[PDB]
Subunit: 127 residues, 2 copies
Amino acid sequence: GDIVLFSGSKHVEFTDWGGTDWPSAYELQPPYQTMPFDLNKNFEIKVDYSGADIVLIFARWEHGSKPQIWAQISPYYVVDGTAVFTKEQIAKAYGSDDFSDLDYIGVKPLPSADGMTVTKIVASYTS
Amino acid sequence: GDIVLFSGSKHVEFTDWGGTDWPSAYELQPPYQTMPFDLNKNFEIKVDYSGADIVLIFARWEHGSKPQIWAQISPYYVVDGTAVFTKEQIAKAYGSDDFSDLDYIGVKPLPSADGMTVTKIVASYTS
């Protein structure tokens, strides 16, 4: 089925890079927050958005001899104000589909004059 | 308006106390996650649930000479499978309506044989 991770009107201002921080529309940290969906299923994440281009981040912080992963992905495709990200695209960027060490999931804008607004985020299982 | 923080079918098993951990249906850590709603508005949180009694936690960890706040609140009321929590009830349990030091928001079950299932969490502004 379909899991709503957010619905409303979340605005993010971000007019240029080069500042230090990169603000988000939505974030999860799996080691610290009970999960709203199960990463082990085959899933897609769909985001209704406008105002800026959008990326999805899966990240693992550096630990020991294992490097930081910063899996920044563009949509698998966009259609009708909606970006679709798939698990198999995410796994290719993450280097595997093993999320047992995943530290961070973030939805972020690219720079724009107007800011990005997200109105809905859903996880859908395709298994 | 109304902001959907979650909708789906989130099950939490928790049959007794005395273990060390207390699992959650939903958690946010405001210092670390961009917020889906604005704590400064007058709001209520409404949760559609069944299977166990439910509480809402607002917490601040101990820092310096300021104590840990563990604002565990029962619903302001329940009606038709839905618990309602209000900002003014939360502020009374938290000791103020100043959320500038809020570390944690959690929705948790009390012990039950069957576990709790949450199907929807919404923040509504009443300002």
